[PDB]
Amino acid sequence: NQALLRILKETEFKKIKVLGSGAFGTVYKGLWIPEGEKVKIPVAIKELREATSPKANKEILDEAYVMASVDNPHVCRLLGICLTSTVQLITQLMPFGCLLDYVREHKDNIGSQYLLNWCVQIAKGMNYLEDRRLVHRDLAARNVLVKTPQHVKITDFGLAKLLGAEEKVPIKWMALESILHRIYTHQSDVWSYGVTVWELMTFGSKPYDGIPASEISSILEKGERLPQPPICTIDVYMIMRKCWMIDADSRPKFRELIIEFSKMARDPQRYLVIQGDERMHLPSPTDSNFYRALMDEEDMDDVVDAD
Numbered sequence: 190n191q192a193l194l195r196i197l198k199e200t201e202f203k204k205i206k207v208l209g210s211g212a213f214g215t216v217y218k219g220l221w222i223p224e225g226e227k228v229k230i231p232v233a234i235k236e237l238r239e240a241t242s243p244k245a246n247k248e249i250l251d252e253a254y255v256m257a258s259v260d261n262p263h264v265c266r267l268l269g270i271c272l273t274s275t276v277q278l279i280t281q282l283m284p285f286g287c288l289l290d291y292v293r294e295h296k297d298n299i300g301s302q303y304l305l306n307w308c309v310q311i312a313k314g315m316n317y318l319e320d321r322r323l324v325h326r327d328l329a330a331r332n333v334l335v336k337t338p339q340h341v342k343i344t345d346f347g348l349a350k351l352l353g354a355e356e357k358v359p360i361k362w363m364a365l366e367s368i369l370h371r372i373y374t375h376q377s378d379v380w381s382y383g384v385t386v387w388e389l390m391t392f393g394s395k396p397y398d399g400i401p402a403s404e405i406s407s408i409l410e411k412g413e414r415l416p417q418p419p420i421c422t423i424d425v426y427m428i429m430r431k432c433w434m435i436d437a438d439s440r441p442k443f444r445e446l447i448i449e450f451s452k453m454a455r456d457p458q459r460y461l462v463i464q465g466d467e468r469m470h471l472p473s474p475t476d477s478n479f480y481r482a483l484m485d486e487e488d489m490d491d492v493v494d495a496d
């Protein structure tokens with residue numbers, strides 16, 4: 190559906206500040222000025238790294254129209270595109286930033302209810318991508334954005350597919366088959382999900398810290414995996430370990446991860462042990478209503494509360 194992707198002209202928007210970057214390009218906070226209006230509307234803009242040609246631009250545009258249909262409350266939707274000598278992708282601006290920076294800044298202030306609800310939401314967004322037959326290829330805590338502390342969304346999915354580069358590097362998030370054979374499936378996205386859950390449970394620790402990328406395949410072949418985070422109980426750790434099994438079909442499915450983490454979120458102190466957890470509950474209905482009115486009016490399934 191062509192109505193889901195807006196083609197933007199360089200004159201109606203401006204990049205104003207750098208927000209960060211990745212393997213695909215630099216991210217900016219921008220301002221959109223609708224034609225004839227005096228308002229400046231904040232947007233997020235990703236400017237892709239490699240310069241592009243008119244032939245490549247037509248193929249990218251065709252793929253972008255399909256990519257703009259990827260609609261779920263836990264996945265950031267591509268809203269607009271500007272195709273000139275560079276490819277610029279426009280999306281809604283998330284003022285809280287990525288979940289990786291969030292868990293680091295609010296470490297020893299985040300409770301089990303939040304940690305477990307973020308795992309559920311990420312699995313929901315990943316299950317929706319699997320329902321759309323779209324392999325993410327770059328799932329990590331840096332690619333989970335915070336709309337509000339209660340609502341996270343996945344970004345940067347299928348960027349190789351958008352560019353027509355699926356058959357052409359975040360080694361520490363990759364399944365062993367992706368490292369060895371560049372094979373990417375919904376099951377290698379499950380391995381990346383286990384690493385992302387590990388990043389959240391360690392409040393943003395670096396996976397395999399100190400170990401060079403070239404040594405990772407050999408470490409995985411010897412059966413070594415990321416260590417049990419100090420807050421995880423054995424049941425949570427066993428789910429992460431199942432995500433990192435050599436046999437891809439032995440890993441859990443995203444629909445099963447939604448069910449297990451939803452069950453755990455219903456008795457959160459039994460699955461995660463955090464000091465001072467009794468005073469780090471989910472917001473009351475009053476606070477939740479206020480956050481939504483000011484920055485999150487979109488439709489979304491209820492957050493899992495404790496029994």
Ligand SMILES: *CCC(=O)N1CC(n2cc(-c3ccncc3)c(-c3cccc(NC(=O)c4cn(C5CC5)cn4)c3)n2)C1
Nearest residue numbers: 209210233234235256267278282283287331345346347351
């Ligand atoms: C904290 C980690 C970090 O620094 N990162 C940079 C990367 N990131 C953040 C954003 C962002 C910030 C704030 N508000 C919103 C987003 C982005 C980002 C910006 C614009 C566009 C995108 N992605 C896409 O447009 C896009 C399109 N697809 C489909 C066509 C394939 C997938 N992603 C991301 N990036 C995290």
